[PDB]
Amino acid sequence: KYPITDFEKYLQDITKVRGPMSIDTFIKEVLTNPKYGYYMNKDVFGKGGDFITAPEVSQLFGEMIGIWCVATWEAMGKPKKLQIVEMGPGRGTLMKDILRSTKVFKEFYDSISVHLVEASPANKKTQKQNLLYFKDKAINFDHKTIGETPNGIKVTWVGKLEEVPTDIPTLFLAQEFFDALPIHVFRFSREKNDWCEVLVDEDITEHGEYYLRFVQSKGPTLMTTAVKHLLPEFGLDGYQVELGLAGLAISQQIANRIDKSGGAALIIDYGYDKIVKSSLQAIRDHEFVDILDKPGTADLSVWVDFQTIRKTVKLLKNKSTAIGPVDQGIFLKEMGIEHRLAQIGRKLDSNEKFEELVMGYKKLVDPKEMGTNYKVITICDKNITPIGFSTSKTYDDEDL
Numbered sequence: 001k002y003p004i005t006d007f008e009k010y011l012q013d014i015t016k017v018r019g020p021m022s023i024d025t026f027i028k029e030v031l032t033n034p035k036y037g038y039y040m041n042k043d044v045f046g047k048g049g050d051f052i053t054a055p056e057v058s059q060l061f062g063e064m065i066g067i068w069c070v071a072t073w074e075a076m077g078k079p080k081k082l083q084i085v086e087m088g089p090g091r092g093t094l095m096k097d098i099l100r101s102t103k104v105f106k107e108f109y110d111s112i113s114v115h116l117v118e119a120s121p122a123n124k125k126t127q128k129q130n131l132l133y134f135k136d137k138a139i140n141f142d143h144k145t146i147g148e149t150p151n152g153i154k155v156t157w158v159g160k161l162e163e164v165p166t167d168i169p170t171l172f173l174a175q176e177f178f179d180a181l182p183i184h185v186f187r188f189s190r191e192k193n194d195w196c197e198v199l200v201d202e203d204i205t206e207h208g209e210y211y212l213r214f215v216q217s218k219g220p221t222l223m224t225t226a227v228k229h230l231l232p233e234f235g236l237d238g239y240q241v242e243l244g245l246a247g248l249a250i251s252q253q254i255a256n257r258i259d260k261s262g263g264a265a266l267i268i269d270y271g272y273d274k275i276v277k278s279s280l281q282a283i284r285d286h287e288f289v290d291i292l293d294k295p296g297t298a299d300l301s302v303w304v305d306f307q308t309i310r311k312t313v314k315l316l317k318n319k320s321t322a323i324g325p326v327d328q329g330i331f332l333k334e335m336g337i338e339h340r341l342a343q344i345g346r347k348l349d350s351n352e353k354f355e356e357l358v359m360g361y362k363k364l365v366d367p368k369e370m371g372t373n374y375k376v377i378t379i380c381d382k383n384i385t386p387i388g389f390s391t392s393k394t395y396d397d398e399d400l
């Protein structure tokens with residue numbers, strides 16, 4: 001029943017002055033608020049720790065993504081200068097594997113610089129410690145936003161995608177980035193015969209279980225109207241959908257960058273090839289808990305709607321398209337992960353470590369693990385056929 005947290009008073013205050021906030025604003029606050037945000041504040045004080053993600057399972061993952069970067073660079077026409085952008089790099093482990101594994105491709109390696117987009121100073125710090133070669137001391141950690149890898153590759157940190165240079169061919173990597181973006185939640189009302197938005201308000205009822213509560217907008221909000229052409233037209237009463245508008249905006253930026261200067265994006269996450277009705281989850285101490293249970297104290301994740309991403313891109317009607325999704329297992333095998341598995345494994349010649357390597361491979365590709373839950377979609381030029389998407393479906397209805 002009790003008691004009220006510092007963050008729940010700040011969030012209850014927003015609702016008093018501005019009225020009930022969106023799920024989007026709510027998640028934006030819980031994750032990215034200074035000083036209460038789940039990222040930046042707490043669960044770090046070092047290299048995170050709780051980062052159990054695909055790159056952290058196996059160098060195999062990073063190496064396959066690296067082969068993809070090189071193969072895609074080849075299909076683009078071996079541009080002399082190439083940007084590699086990672087959205088939400090985490091510890092930097094994925095990027096570290098890529099830069100380690102792609103060094104042998106001399107021509108490729110000489111054309112690349114890296115741009116990491118990252119909002120958390122703590123994750124920024126971990127990424128830099130890792131990845132960077134420090135030649136002299138007396139580095140000012142935040143003011144100097146650029147550094148150099150031990151192999152001389154240039155890495156620049158930025159807070160938003162918008163700050164990355166434009167008019168240079170660019171690869172974009174987003175791995176467990178989209179599931180941490182804010183979403184809006186919409187619900188159909190027969191009474192209004194229109195969509196309403198689920199909002200977060202005060203809870204000052206008698207038996208108010210958590211201080212905050214899920215309310216519903218009266219009329220259709222700005223956001224409902226803005227996205228109405230992506231919401232199902234057919235609506236039973238109370239029918240409810242999540243939409244990651246933050247991610248759609250990012251998808252549009254990427255699609256347009258590719259349209260202007262060329263490139264390709266690789267978006268990897270757990271999600272569905274359909275609109276997602278309900279997925280927003282809050283985990284804490286290895287248990288699922290209520291989204292409104294001490295907000296800030298639990299990690300909020302979403303399952304990614306790959307379908308709306310794809311449509312949203314295509315709806316720009318320029319040189320970019322979106323191909324996918326395909327299952328992570330199918331993608332990784334199609335990139336040659338089993339060849340690398342046996343190449344790396346042959347070198348280990350320690351049998352207990354070999355089993356370690358295989359188990360991480362199984363986690364990545366086996367359907368009962370990450371193999372099917374995780375999926376891959378690409379944003380790219382219509383003219384340049386992507387690498388690793390031979391199993392992608394053709395969506396004849398959406399292609400006009």
Ligand SMILES: Nc1ncnc2c1ncn2[C@@H]1O[C@H](CSCC[C@H](N)C(=O)O)[C@@H](O)[C@H]1O
Nearest residue numbers: 039053088089090117118119120123175176
């Ligand atoms: N709105 C936003 N803009 C930029 N970075 C963000 C963001 N929201 C979250 N992030 C960052 O994205 C990452 C999400 S966690 C995923 C980390 C890494 N990809 C891995 O596989 O382990 C974190 O580094 C977090 O700080």
